């Protein structure tokens, strides 16, 4: 960025139940106010600008939108440029227009704004926006320099049978009963240092009983799993959940992974936990002595 500033506020309006307000704020980092400049906006799948608003703007001075773009039916307007006669070097020049979702969808991609002066395009800045995603930023998982995609689902009527099934698929490669030592967290990616209490089915990871293994998850999954320390756990996943090289290996908290809170010795004495502690127990023997039916 640096040549331009860009603050894109995507807020809901007061007073449908979906419609909101997009606000765009730009300033030029220089001595004079920039000359003619471009705002290259795009709508979030499902939205498109309120027209009555867009006109308002174009009537404005310092600003203009081409007839060509006005005439189209709001529905047909999923990108759109707003030309500017200037952008102040001094303070932020801002504006906004109500957008409306007319279309019902799951997984709504983020819109984005872009700015620059007509003369030079490589000196642009480019801010995303989105209702849930914090910064209009997709969900990734990056340690140091290596990133991998995490826009999938968190992990996801349980019978010893439903487990002797899902737990023999191709992906499954590690099946563990592990106790959780350290519960760390960060603004980006929280981790977990769980030590392995019994290697139920060994994987491409040469890990002896007792050793500690480091799992990770996106900061957006705090709700999916109630985290407790010294709480024992049953879990399995794939060997594609492996992070970086050996033997400093890690585990990735994904969709293809399964998570269930393994009760405690004297907690299973309860008369509602029994339906579990038993299924579990059996599962243990059924995976150690026999293995997978296939």
């Amino acid at each position: 960025c640096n040549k331009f500033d860009l603050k894109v506020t995507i807020k809901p309006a007061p007073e449908a139940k979906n419609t909101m307000i997009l606000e765009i704020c730009t300033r030029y980092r220089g001595d004079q106010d920039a000359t003619m400049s471009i705002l290259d906006i795009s709508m979030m799948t499902g939205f498109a600008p309120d027209t009555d608003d867009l006109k308002q703007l174009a009537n404005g001075v310092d600003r203009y939108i081409s007839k060509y773009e006005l005439d189209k039916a709001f529905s047909d307007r999923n990108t759109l440029i707003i030309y500017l006669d200037k952008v102040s070097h001094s303070e932020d020049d801002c504006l906004a227009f109500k957008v409306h979702q007319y279309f019902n969808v799951e997984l709504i991609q983020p819109g984005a704004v872009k700015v620059y002066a007509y003369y030079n395009l490589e000196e642009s800045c480019t801010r995303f926006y989105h209702p849930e995603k914090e910064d209009g930023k997709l969900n990734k998982l990056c340690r140091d320099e290596l990133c991998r995609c995490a826009e999938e689902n968190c992990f996801i009527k349980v019978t010893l049978e439903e487990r002797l099934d899902k737990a023999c698929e191709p992906g499954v490669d590690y099946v563990y009963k592990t106790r959780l030592v350290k519960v760390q967290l960060s603004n980006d990616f929280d981790e977990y240092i769980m030590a392995i209490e019994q290697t139920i089915k060994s994987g491409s990871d040469e890990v002896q009983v007792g050793q500690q293994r480091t799992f990770i998850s996106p900061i957006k999954c705090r709700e999916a799993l109630k985290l407790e320390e010294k709480k024992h756990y049953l879990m399995w996943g794939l060997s594609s959940d492996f992070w970086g090289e050996k033997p400093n290996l890690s585990y990735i908290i994904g969709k293809d992974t399964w998570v269930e809170h393994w009760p405690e010795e004297d907690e299973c004495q309860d008369e509602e936990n029994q339906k579990q502690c038993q299924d579990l127990g059996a599962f243990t023997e059924s995976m150690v002595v026999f293995g997978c039916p296939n």
């Binding site: 000359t35 003619m36 471009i38 290259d40 081409s66 007839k67 060509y68 990108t79 007509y118």
Partner: protein, 639 residues
Amino acid sequence: SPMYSIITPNILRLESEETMVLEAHDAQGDVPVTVTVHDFPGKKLVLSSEKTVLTPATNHMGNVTFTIPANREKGRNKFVTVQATFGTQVVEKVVLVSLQSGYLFIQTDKTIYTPGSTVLYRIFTVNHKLLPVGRTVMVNIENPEGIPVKQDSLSSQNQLGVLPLSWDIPELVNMGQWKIRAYYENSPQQVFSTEFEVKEYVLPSFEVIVEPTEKFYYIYNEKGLEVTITARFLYGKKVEGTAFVIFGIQDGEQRISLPESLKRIPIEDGSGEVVLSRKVLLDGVQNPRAEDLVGKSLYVSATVILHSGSDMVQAERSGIPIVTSPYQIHFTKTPKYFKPGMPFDLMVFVTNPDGSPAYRVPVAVQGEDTVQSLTQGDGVAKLSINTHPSQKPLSITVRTKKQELSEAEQATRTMQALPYSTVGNSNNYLHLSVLRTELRPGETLNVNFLLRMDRAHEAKIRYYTYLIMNKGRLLKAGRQVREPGQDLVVLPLSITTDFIPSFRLVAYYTLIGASGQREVVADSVWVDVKDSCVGSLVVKSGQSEDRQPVPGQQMTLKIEGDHGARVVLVAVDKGVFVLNKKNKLTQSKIWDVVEKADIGCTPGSGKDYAGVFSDAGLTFTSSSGQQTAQRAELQCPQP
């Protein structure tokens, strides 16, 4: 008294055939002649092999064909002494020679490459006749700070004059204007260069074109400069979008933008209108005597954006002239010497400001109101004035005469033509009046041979000896016979493709008269023929009729050209040319290389008998000692 004359090109060339004209004037029976070239000074006998006889059959006119080798021989011109011996008599002359082998042209597949994209290139190699020859060539690839980053050495022997080549552009490297240079291993000094830009780019999906309604701006034009902006995809289709336009003034290489002239217009249905107003243009400098702005130029940069925001394109029309008159006037295609009494054919050249030939424009001279003549499609106007037999310099001044232009808006120019300075001031002249249009090979041109002298020695003159220069070599040398009492004789000149792009004609006669004085009267004329390939080449469509082809589809290509010729193909996404259209190969670019290499430096004639000869690329040495000013300068007279 017999007289032998030797006529050669002003400047010879290595490893190529040259020709020189042997003549026996007023002699009897067969005359055997031996011709020899020696290095200068001294003796190396570089070429003696050739012998010939001037039979009374062929009116004593000789053919010289020879090829000077390139033996182990600077900054100082090397010469040679030619020696022609008729019977026992021995005439000779000391001419200039050049190491200049011929030409070189380079072709690159694109005009512009990205780091890591290979550049294909061909070196076409030819002699001064533009015929494919085979020598050894060196080829450098300079980076944009001039430093050779690669060279090879290649021979064009048995390659029909075409050297394929490539170079893999490294991944990291300076962007900027790279250059490919090549010279004949014989002559390093005559280097040849073509450029190519290395940049980072994606191709654009349309082209943008800026255009002033006029090819110039008139300072008193209240409307300012009007400009129409035009955008259309590469697949031919009209563009919608908005476009930012802005102007400036150029002085020399110096460039001032008029920040205030910035305008944002809509590009609708592939087009848009926009204007610089006289006010901005003047304010934009400092607001002074508009006259001041005369001579400078304007420019416009436009930048279109599709309404989709996907793709941008810049483009700029540069150096639009600020002028007080629309037309310019040039005498550089008109000779600078006339014959008093004889009609003088004026070749006025009328260019638009930019430089382009202006069609159908009227012109006439100072004196006479009735004389007018337009400008044929070549920006040329043929006007002829009958001159007075006065030994006074003849100053002519021409002036445009277009209706709808004010007499201040019209453009003029003046030249000065001197009379032909005869021998002993005898008043003997020769004029070649040639009908002047667009000559084309096949068409037949008439050369009026007009004799100007006292009937006293009129019966004496029996024949005209004529010659043809072309690409700076002899293309033909013949005789035109005459009978006493005749002042006009007409020469049927067949015009073949071997005449392109322009040929010179020098006719001369010789006689004894007045008081036992050996004389030479002559005349030289330039005639620019219609420029175009010497053979032909065309690439039209295969399927006589059809709808547009489709991505990946088979299409038949048709190539109509000379039998046995070699064609070398390349097809280029025209999107490239929207990033860079410079440095392409053109045939017009080649004709331009060939003319600037002319050894003849004048449109027509000579100050004296001996000038006509040195003005066209020629020397005349006779037994009687009437030789031409030796030539020892490689280039023409520094302008």
